[PDB]
Amino acid sequence: ACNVRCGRGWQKRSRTCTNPAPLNGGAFCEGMSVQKITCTA
Amino acid sequence: DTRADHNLIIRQARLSDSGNYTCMAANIVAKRRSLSATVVVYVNGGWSSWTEWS
Amino acid sequence: LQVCLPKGPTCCSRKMEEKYQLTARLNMEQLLQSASMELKFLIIQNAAVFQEAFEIVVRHAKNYTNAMFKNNYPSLTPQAFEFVGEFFTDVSLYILGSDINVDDMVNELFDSLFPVIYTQMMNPGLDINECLRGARRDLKVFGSFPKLIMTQVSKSLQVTRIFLQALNLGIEVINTTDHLKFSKDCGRMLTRMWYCSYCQGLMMVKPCGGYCNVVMQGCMAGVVEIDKYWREYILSLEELVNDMENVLLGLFSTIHDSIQYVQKNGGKLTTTIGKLCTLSSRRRELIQKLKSFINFYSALPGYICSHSPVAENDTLCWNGQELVERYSQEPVVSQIIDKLKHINQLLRTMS
Amino acid sequence: LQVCLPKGPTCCSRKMEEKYQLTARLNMEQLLQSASMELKFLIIQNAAVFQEAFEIVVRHAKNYTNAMFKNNYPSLTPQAFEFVGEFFTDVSLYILGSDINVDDMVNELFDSLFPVIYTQMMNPGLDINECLRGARRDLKVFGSFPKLIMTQVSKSLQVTRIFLQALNLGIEVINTTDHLKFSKDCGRMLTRMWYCSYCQGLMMVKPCGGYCNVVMQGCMAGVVEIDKYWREYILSLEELVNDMENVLLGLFSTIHDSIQYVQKNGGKLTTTIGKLCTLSSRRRELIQKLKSFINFYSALPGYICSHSPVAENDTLCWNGQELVERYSQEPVVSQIIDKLKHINQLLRTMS
Ligand SMILES: *[C@@H]1O[C@H](CO)[C@@H](O)[C@H](O)[C@H]1NC(C)=O
Ligand SMILES: *[C@@H]1O[C@H](CO)[C@@H](O)[C@H](O)[C@H]1NC(C)=O
Ligand SMILES: *[C@@H]1O[C@H](CO)[C@@H](O)[C@H](O)[C@H]1NC(C)=O
């Protein structure tokens, strides 16, 4: 939900590296883990 | 053994000999049969240790 | 029919039996997801928060080191910013599990730091650069400071790296729980327990508590064996939390003192070289919240039966085949246990 | 010590124990070879004799076909000798187990036979050879004769080939018996039963009959399971013997009649082509002698104990650890059973 009720707000989306999770020095997930977009309420 | 990615692995051609192996997919809609693979186990010819001279 | 044992007539065909089987599979998966969702979201939240917090710590420490370079050694900037940025970039890459050598980080840091110190602070006035880099280690100009920082930061960075990997593997196994495919026999038993009563024309009859118990203890015989390893995982994580913020934040003081130490012997050094050339609170709350789920795998069949519609009284209930007055009475699991054993060994070896 | 249970003192070290173990291995292998030698030589002799007898039959049949070509169709020689020799060479190669196509033998025979018939018998007077070879099959000049010979000879040649393959596989499994390596536990038990009495200073004491029985039934638990399949092998071979000499020897009459048949329509054929272009006794004695060894695998531990030095009275004997007054009381095998199952199915399908 947009944290700010009136004006510029925020919306977050998480993307974890757990399917599968790296083990014994496996290469970690490539790119970004969080996504943020500006919203107007 | 049956694998999660639909594969039939045979380690030794002894406990599972030749045959017409066929893959069949089953669903709530219907069933579908794949083209049967003719898996034949072959034994290569192996001579013998020499005998004594007559 | 191949699932619904036909005692009398029946209101359902074979295709309706397949529909009931698929709905049984989906209902079981939904119940497992509902059981695992709270713990999954707890560990996901904590993994994300700790990752961002460690990145904040690394950024703040790089900023503090850069600021103290700007303030105390303006003659070493802007080259100081380059090697500090490279050092803390490699720091973050190591924290996030990349193959980085800590000794190599510190050694490249001092290798880059010594030539600018020599050219700007000791002998004011690029091709000779490698001779200075070699003399740095050959003459041990920084004394014991490089090995001190090496151990100081390796000890904390390794425990942090293993903490993050442990959180991620817990997320992985909790994700595995709700996708556990079961036997065909269990599919048919769940179909009988949940739906086969509808084939006999009953509308609101629920299965017996004891029948749910026998069915659940029937197909969860493998999943319950994970409980020992999950408990050991929880306890080993508790062993590990009982470290990296203080070290990275004192790095600037250590580097400043090392620069003073090198400047102390400038007389001999210049001539020889001229000739020669709230975190702990968060992990505590996380462990105290994680200990509330130590019974997760052992209480799981109890959850499935206590959240499915069942006749607890075992009176006027469905026993899988008839309405009774009283009731009569690995590969994926192996991978879960393998990864739990691996992470538990890795945990226990650290502390 | 790791084999000799030291109850009192001991007269032997660990190296002497290893020597006793290797001598136990050699003694067991020698006993198995002595048990298997009579049957091995029987099957080897019969395989060799039947091979030579079949080769004699094939040579005599080729000679008879060549003689009837010399006598009845001199115009077809010497080309007739070439295709007859190639045909019977491929016959023998098929009998001896080589990948030869029977239909291809007959078809190449008639393909080679037709052009010389056309050039020397029908139209007297190298590049046009292939047009005649194609016309042979395109116009079906030989009628049903090729398919008649095809089935006639395929039926006999397949049973003879499988007879020889069965003899060879029997040789193989009987050869494997005396090379059967055993478990390490059995090695130590045989060392105790045969030699560990010498480590306790006893000179002529023999092991108890019951102790030999328990040891042998201990390490031959796998070998005894072969007995069912060996019995089925013997009986299936008996099923098969209850055929090829008469066929190969009547081949000349069949070919002569086919040549007459082709010459019968020469009028139309020439114009169209000009425009277009004691054995049975031996196998019976072999089966009757082979049925005397049907108990070979079941009587094998009895043989090992009855041919090893043992105290049959079970009085004043060695029990593996002490001298008593009275006694208290596999991958290669899988391969043997697999090949026996295969050859038995092949046998039963033939007859
Ligand atoms: C297998 O398939 C072949 C051809 O694809 C066929 O001739 C044979 O009779 C089949 N039957 C089996 C292996 O049972
Ligand atoms: C018996 O086994 C031995 C092992 O060397 C082998 O060399 C010999 O040829 C065998 N006899 C056969 C194959 O019939
Ligand atoms: C550190 O970071 C701040 C911004 O967060 C910046 O204003 C400051 O100049 C830096 N300190 C230095 C470069 O001395």
Go through C47-83 and write b for each residue having 16 or more CB atoms within 10 A of its CB, e for each that does not: bbebbeebeebbeebbebbbebbeeebeebeebbeeb
Chains that touch D (3 or more CB pairs under 8 A): B
Half-sphere exposure of C199 toward its Cβ, with a 13 Å CA cutoff?
30
Q: At what angle do helices C245-264 and C145-177 cross, to 10 degrees?
A: 160
Query: C48–A14: do the CB atoms touch at under 8 Å?
Result: yes
How far from chain centre, in Å, is Cα D300?
Answer: 22
Contacts of C98 in chain A (CB under 8 A): 28
Question: Which structure tokens are listed for C176?
Answer: 């595995």
Closest CA to C308 of C182, C185, C213: C213
Dihedral angle sign, alpha carbons of residues D98, D99, D102, D107: negative
The alpha carbon of residue D238 and the mean position of all alpha carbons in its chain are separated, in whole angstroms, by 14
Q: Beta-carbon neighbour count of residue C274 at 10 Å? A: 10
Question: Phi, psi (5° rounding) for residue A16?
Answer: -90, 160
Cβ pair C50, C42 in contact under 8 A:
no
Nearest residue CA, atom 10 of ligand 2? D175
CA distance C123 to C114: 12
Residues 6+ apart with CB under 8 A from D101: none
HSE (side-chain half, CA atoms, 13 Å) at C339: 21
Nearest ligand 2 atom to the CA of B49 is: 9
Which chain B residue has the Cα nearest residue D96?
B45
* DSSP designation for D281: H
Which residues of A lie closer than 8 Å to C, measured between beta carbons?
Answer: 14, 16-26, 28, 33-34
Instruction: Estimate to the nearest angstrom the gap between the alpha carbon of C234 and the chain centroid.
Output: 12
The gap from C-alpha C4 to its chain's centroid, in whole angstroms, comes to 44
- Are the C-beta atoms of B30 and B53 separated by less than 8 Å? no
Strand partners of residue B30: none
The answer to whether residues D10 and D4 touch, using CB atoms and an 8 Å cutoff, is yes
CB-based contacts of C201, cutoff 8 Å, min separation 6: C11
Query: How far, in Å, CA of D248 to CA of D127, rounded?
Result: 33
Please give the Cα distance from C309 to C243 (Å, whole number): 49
Across the interface, do B14 and D335 touch by the CB < 8 Å criterion?
yes
Q: What kind and span of H or E run contains C5?
A: none
Is the CB of residue C63 below 6 angstroms from any atom belonging to ligand 3? yes
The owner of tokens 């903490």 is: C163
d(CA C254, CA C146): 10
Q: What backbone phi and psi angles, to 5 degrees, belong to D317?
A: -130, 170
Do the Cβ atoms of C196 and C320 come closer than 8 Å? Answer: yes
Q: Residue type for C118, please?
A: Y
Q: Residue A33's closest chain C neighbor by CA? A: C48
Contact state of C47 with A25 under an 8 Å Cβ cutoff: no
8 Å CB contact between D233 and D325: no
Q: Provide the strand spans (E) within D75-122.
A: none
**How far apart are the CA of B41 and the centre of ligand 1, in A?**
14
Phi, psi torsion values for A2, nearest 5 degrees: -65, 110
Q: Which two tokens stand for residue D188?
A: 């130590």
Q: Which residues pair with C315 in a beta bridge?
A: C326
Cα-Cα-Cα-Cα dihedral sign, residues D280, D282, D283, D289: positive
Q: Quick check: CB of B19 below 6 Å from ligand 1?
A: yes
Quote the ligand 2 centre to D175 CA distance (angstroms): 6
Q: How far apart are CA C114 and CA C14, in angstroms?
A: 81
B38 pocket-lining for ligand 1 (C-beta < 6 Å): yes
**Spatial contact of D42 and D291, defined as CB atoms under 8 Å apart:** no
Q: How many Cβ atoms from other residues are within 10 Å of residue A40's Cβ?
A: 9
Helix (H, G, I), strand (E, B) or coil at A7: coil
Query: CB-based contact (8 Å) between C26 and chain B?
Result: no
Amino acid present at C328 = S
Q: In this structure, what are the phi and psi dihedrals at residue C206, rounded to the nearest 5 degrees?
A: -105, 155
Cβ–Cβ < 8 Å for D277, D128: yes
Matching residue, tokens 């118990």: C213
| Distance separating alpha carbons of residues C62 and C85, to the nearest angstrom | 7
* Spatial CA neighbour of C342 closest among C179, C232, C225: C232
Best of B44, B47, B48, B50 for a ligand 2 pocket test (most atoms within 8 Å of beta carbon): B48
3-state helix, strand, coil in chain A (%, to 5): 0, 35, 65
CA neighbor of C223 nearest in space, from C46, C58, C28, C89: C28
Question: Alpha-carbon dihedral of residues D14, D20, D26, D31, nearest 10 degrees?
Answer: -150
Q: How many residues does chain B have?
A: 54
Other Cβ atoms within 10 Å of D275 Cβ, number: 7
CA-CA distance, C99 to C92, in Å (whole number)?
11
3-state secondary structure (DSSP) of residue D317: strand
Does A20 sit behind a cis peptide bond, omega within 30 degrees of 0 on the bond before it? Answer: yes
- CA-closest candidate to residue D292, choices D39, D17, D25: D39
Q: State how far the alpha carbon of C310 is from the alpha carbons of C20, C196, C207, in Å.
A: 18, 14, 5
Are C97 and A18 inside 8 Å of each other by CB? no
Residue C282 in contact with residue C49, Cβ under 8 Å? yes
Q: Would you state the structure tokens that stand for residue B42, as one six-digit string?
A: 């072959």
| Closest in A20, A23, A26 to C342, CB measured | A23
Rounded Cα distance between D73 and D118, Å, is 13
Copy the structure tokens of residue D169.
């596989």
Ligand closest to D40 (CA) is: 2
- Token duo for residue C142: 């920084």
Residues in chain A, how many?
41
The greatest distance separating any two alpha carbons of chain D, rounded to the nearest whole angstrom, comes to: 106
Identify how many contiguous H helices and E strands chain B contains and give both numbers. 0, 4
Q: Which of D103, D116, D113 is nearest to D149 (CA)?
A: D103
Specify the DSSP class assigned to residue D233.
H
Q: What end-to-end distance do the CA atoms of chain C give, in Å?
A: 58
Q: What angle do CA D258, D259, D261 make, to 5 degrees?
A: 60
Distance CA(C122)–CA(C262), nearest Å, equals 10
Report angle CA D337, D343, D346 to the nearest 5 degrees.
Answer: 140
| Listed resolution, Å | 4.0
Q: Which helix (H) or strand (E) holds D98?
A: none
- Name every residue whose Cβ is closer than 8 Å to that of residue D94 and which is 6 or more positions away in sequence: D100, D102, D105, D157, D161
Rounded Cα–Cα distance for residues B38 and B19 (Å):
6
Residues 6+ apart with CB under 8 A from D243: D156, D159, D160
Residue whose tokens read 């994700």: C175
Are C148 and C254 in contact by the 8 Å Cβ rule? The answer is yes
Q: How many CB atoms within 10 Å of residue D310? A: 22
Residue in C18, C331, C332 closest to B28 by CB: C18
CA distance C224 to C71: 60
DSSP string covering D114-146, please? Answer: HHHHIIIIIS----THHHHHHHHHHTTTTTTHH
Angle of helix D279-290 relative to helix D227-241, nearest 10 degrees, comes to 160
Contacting residues for C101 by C-beta, under 8 A, at least 6 apart: none
Core vs surface per residue D143-163: b (16+ CB within 10 A) or e: eebbeebbebbbebbebbbbb
Cβ atoms within 10 Å, residue B5: 5
D259's tokens:
């040549």
Assign 3-class secondary structure to C56-118: HHHHHHHHHHHHHHHHHCHHHCCHHHHHHHHHHHHHHHHHCCCCCCHHHHHHHHHHHHHHHHH
Q: Is the peptide bond before D78 cis (omega within 30 degrees of 0)?
A: yes
Residue partners of D26: CB distance under 8 A and separation at least 6? none
Q: Cα(C333)–Cα(C297) distance, rounded to whole angstroms?
A: 12
Interface of B with D (CB under 8 A): 14-15, 17, 45
* Cis check: omega of the bond before C78, within 30 degrees of 0: yes
Tell me how far apart the terminal alpha carbons of chain D are, to the nearest angstrom. Answer: 57
3+ Cβ–Cβ pairs closer than 8 Å linking C and B? yes
Please report, for residues C111, D96, D290, the alpha-carbon distance to residue D170 in angstroms, rounded to integers and kept in the order given. Answer: 76, 16, 11
Torsion of CA D209, D211, D214, D220, to 10 degrees: -80
Of residues D304, D24, D19, the one with CA closest to residue D192: D24
Query: Which residues, judged by CB distance below 6 Å to any ligand atom, belong to the binding site of ligand 2?
Result: B 48-49; D 171, 175, 179
Instruction: Say which ligand is closest to the CA of B37.
Output: 1
